[PDB]
Enzyme design. Sequence first.
Site, PDB file in Angstrom:
ATOM      1  N   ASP A 145      -4.607  -2.868  12.651  1.00  0.00           N
ATOM      2  CA  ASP A 145      -4.529  -1.982  11.485  1.00  0.00           C
ATOM      3  C   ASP A 145      -4.707  -0.597  12.087  1.00  0.00           C
ATOM      4  O   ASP A 145      -5.819  -0.306  12.544  1.00  0.00           O
ATOM      5  CB  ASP A 145      -5.598  -2.388  10.483  1.00  0.00           C
TER       6      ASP A 145
ATOM      7  N   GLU B 260      -7.253  -7.567   9.907  1.00  0.00           N
ATOM      8  CA  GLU B 260      -8.413  -7.049   9.180  1.00  0.00           C
ATOM      9  C   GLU B 260      -9.434  -8.181   9.262  1.00  0.00           C
ATOM     10  O   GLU B 260     -10.481  -7.971   9.888  1.00  0.00           O
ATOM     11  CB  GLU B 260      -8.272  -6.570   7.721  1.00  0.00           C
TER      12      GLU B 260
ATOM     13  N   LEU C  52      -4.873   2.400  10.941  1.00  0.00           N
ATOM     14  CA  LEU C  52      -5.821   3.220  10.168  1.00  0.00           C
ATOM     15  C   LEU C  52      -6.325   2.409   8.978  1.00  0.00           C
ATOM     16  O   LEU C  52      -5.590   2.009   8.062  1.00  0.00           O
ATOM     17  CB  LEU C  52      -5.159   4.546   9.789  1.00  0.00           C
ATOM     18  N   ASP C  53      -7.615   2.080   8.965  1.00  0.00           N
ATOM     19  CA  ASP C  53      -8.204   1.276   7.913  1.00  0.00           C
ATOM     20  C   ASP C  53      -9.094   2.173   7.041  1.00  0.00           C
ATOM     21  O   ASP C  53      -9.854   2.955   7.617  1.00  0.00           O
ATOM     22  CB  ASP C  53      -9.049   0.121   8.453  1.00  0.00           C
TER      23      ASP C  53
ATOM     24  N   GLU D 200      -0.126  -3.611  10.456  1.00  0.00           N
ATOM     25  CA  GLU D 200      -0.085  -3.517   9.014  1.00  0.00           C
ATOM     26  C   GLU D 200       1.155  -2.762   8.522  1.00  0.00           C
ATOM     27  O   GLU D 200       1.715  -3.045   7.456  1.00  0.00           O
ATOM     28  CB  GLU D 200      -1.357  -2.811   8.495  1.00  0.00           C
ATOM     29  N   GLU D 201       1.537  -1.721   9.242  1.00  0.00           N
ATOM     30  CA  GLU D 201       2.572  -0.814   8.862  1.00  0.00           C
ATOM     31  C   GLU D 201       3.984  -1.215   9.221  1.00  0.00           C
ATOM     32  O   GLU D 201       4.903  -0.454   8.934  1.00  0.00           O
ATOM     33  CB  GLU D 201       2.214   0.537   9.510  1.00  0.00           C
TER      34      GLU D 201
ATOM     35  N   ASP E 112      -1.497   7.194   8.432  1.00  0.00           N
ATOM     36  CA  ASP E 112      -1.050   5.843   8.749  1.00  0.00           C
ATOM     37  C   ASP E 112       0.115   5.901   9.740  1.00  0.00           C
ATOM     38  O   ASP E 112       0.211   5.163  10.725  1.00  0.00           O
ATOM     39  CB  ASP E 112      -0.611   5.089   7.491  1.00  0.00           C
TER      40      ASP E 112
ATOM     41  N   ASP F 228       0.843  -1.194   0.000  1.00  0.00           N
ATOM     42  CA  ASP F 228       0.000   0.000   0.000  1.00  0.00           C
ATOM     43  C   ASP F 228       0.886   1.255   0.000  1.00  0.00           C
ATOM     44  O   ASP F 228       2.036   1.171   0.432  1.00  0.00           O
ATOM     45  CB  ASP F 228      -0.918   0.045   1.210  1.00  0.00           C
TER      46      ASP F 228
HETATM   47  O1  LIG Z   1     -10.756  -0.467  -3.405  1.00  0.00           O
HETATM   48  P1  LIG Z   1     -11.129  -1.899  -3.022  1.00  0.00           P
HETATM   49  O2  LIG Z   1     -10.301  -2.947  -3.799  1.00  0.00           O
HETATM   50  O3  LIG Z   1     -12.614  -2.146  -3.019  1.00  0.00           O
HETATM   51  O4  LIG Z   1     -10.594  -2.131  -1.509  1.00  0.00           O
HETATM   52  C1  LIG Z   1     -11.303  -1.514  -0.409  1.00  0.00           C
HETATM   53  C2  LIG Z   1     -10.817  -2.200   0.865  1.00  0.00           C
HETATM   54  O5  LIG Z   1      -9.428  -1.864   1.049  1.00  0.00           O
HETATM   55  C3  LIG Z   1      -9.156  -1.434   2.390  1.00  0.00           C
HETATM   56  O6  LIG Z   1      -8.949  -0.026   2.392  1.00  0.00           O
HETATM   57  C4  LIG Z   1      -7.985  -2.187   2.997  1.00  0.00           C
HETATM   58  O7  LIG Z   1      -6.818  -2.031   2.216  1.00  0.00           O
HETATM   59  C5  LIG Z   1     -10.449  -1.773   3.151  1.00  0.00           C
HETATM   60  O8  LIG Z   1     -10.670  -0.815   4.186  1.00  0.00           O
HETATM   61  C6  LIG Z   1     -11.584  -1.754   2.106  1.00  0.00           C
HETATM   62  O9  LIG Z   1     -12.507  -2.799   2.462  1.00  0.00           O
HETATM   63  O1  LIG Z   2      -5.021  -0.849   3.884  1.00  0.00           O
HETATM   64  P1  LIG Z   2      -5.755   0.137   4.732  1.00  0.00           P
HETATM   65  O2  LIG Z   2      -6.847   1.032   4.200  1.00  0.00           O
HETATM   66  O3  LIG Z   2      -5.707  -0.179   6.206  1.00  0.00           O
HETATM   67 MG   LIG Z   3      -7.551  -1.802   6.642  1.00  0.00          MG
HETATM   68 MG   LIG Z   4      -4.443   0.441   7.415  1.00  0.00          MG
HETATM   69 MG   LIG Z   5      -3.062   0.212   4.001  1.00  0.00          MG
END
Ligand SMILES: O=P(O)(O)OC[C@H]1O[C@](O)(CO)[C@@H](O)[C@@H]1O
Ligand SMILES: O=[P-]([O-])[O-]
Ligand SMILES: [Mg+2]
Ligand SMILES: [Mg+2]
Ligand SMILES: [Mg+2]
Length: 328
Positions: free
Chosen positions: A111, A273, A113-114, A90-91, A67, A61
Site C-alpha cells: 500500500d 494491509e 500510502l495508507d 493497492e493503486e 497516492d 477509493d
Molecule cells: O473511515 P474508516 O471506515 O474507519 O476506515 C479507516 C481505515 O481505512 C484506511 O484508510 C484504508 O482504506 C485505513 O488506513 C484505516 O484503518
Molecule cells: O486506502 P488507503 O488509505 O491506503
Molecule cells: Mg491503507
Molecule cells: Mg493506500
Molecule cells: Mg486507498
Amino acid sequence: TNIVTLTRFVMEEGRKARGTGEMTQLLNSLCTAVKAISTAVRKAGIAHLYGIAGSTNVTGDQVKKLDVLSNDLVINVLKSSFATCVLVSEEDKNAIIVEPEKRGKYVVCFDPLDGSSNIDCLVSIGTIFGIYRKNSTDEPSEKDALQPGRNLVAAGYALYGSATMLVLAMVNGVNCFMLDPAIGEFILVDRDVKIKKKGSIYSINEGYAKEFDPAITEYIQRKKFPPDNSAPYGARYVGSMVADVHRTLVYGGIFMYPANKKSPKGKLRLLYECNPMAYVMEKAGGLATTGKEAVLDIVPTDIHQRAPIILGSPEDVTELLEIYQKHA
Ligand SMILES: O=P(O)(O)OC[C@H]1O[C@](O)(CO)[C@@H](O)[C@@H]1O
Ligand SMILES: O=[P-]([O-])[O-]
Ligand SMILES: [Mg+2]
Ligand SMILES: [Mg+2]
Ligand SMILES: [Mg+2]
C-alpha cells in the site's frame, strides 16, 4: 560514530546464513522510496500535494495526489532493486511483472500510502509492505502474489508520524528503525519488539455501530462496562491503519476493522494491509484474526481481496474470539 542502520542490521542478520543479499538490496531500495515519500509528506501543503488525483482504484477509493507519487516511487525503486519479479499495489488493477533483466526472487505487495482520509488534516499516514519468495519455476505472474500471509519472509510499514519509523518484521522478530532526517538513514531504536499480553486500549470506528455483528457489539460493551468492575478500556481511533496498529504494537490492546452487516469481508485489503500487519503482530507475540480464522492462513483468490481483521494483544484478541465462538 557506530551507525546501526537498517542496512547493517539486515546484513548482520545474515552473515553466517548464506543468503543472496537480494533482501538487503530490496530493503535498501524500499528505504529510499520511504525517505522520498516522507520528505514529500512533510512539505505537502507547500508543494501543493494535497487533493485528489482524478481516478478511482479497483477497491473504489478516491485517488489522492500523494497516492500516485508514492506509488510511482515504490514501483520504480523496487524495479531497479534487481530483487523483485511481481509487484502488487493497492493503486494498480493488475500485478506488475518486472521486466526480465531486472528480476530477482521476491514478490512485493504494498500500500504505497495508507490513511488517505487523514492526509489533508495532517494526521499520521504510512506505507505498508509484505514480501514473499516466488515459489514456482513458471514465468512470474499475478498468481505468485496469491500466497497466504504465513508464507511471508518479511513485512512491515513506514509510519510518517511525529517522526518517521520503519517497522520491519522477519522470521526472528520485529525491530523499529527511526529515520534520522539529518543523514537520511534509518537507525535501530527498538530491538526485538514484543507486544504486551493484555492492553487497555480498544481501537474501532464506532460510527459503524448500527452494522456491527453481535460479537463486536458485546465486546465493545464489555470494554466500557467491565463485568468485574475493572477500569474501562480507553478508546483510540486515529483512522489510519498504520498509526492505530503501531500504537497497538507499542502500547498493547486491540485494533478492529471487522466484518459487518454491509461488508462480509470488512474493508481492509488482505494482500497489502491485513497480511503485513498480521505478520508483524504474530512476530511480536500478538494475534490477528478475522473473528473466525487466522488472517495469515487465508489463501487469497483476488489480489484486491478484502478481509476482516482484529489484531493486537493475545489476551484481548482471544477474549473477542471467545465471544465469536459463543455466538456461533
Ligand atoms: O473511515 P474508516 O471506515 O474507519 O476506515 C479507516 C481505515 O481505512 C484506511 O484508510 C484504508 O482504506 C485505513 O488506513 C484505516 O484503518
Ligand atoms: O486506502 P488507503 O488509505 O491506503
Ligand atoms: Mg491503507
Ligand atoms: Mg493506500
Ligand atoms: Mg486507498
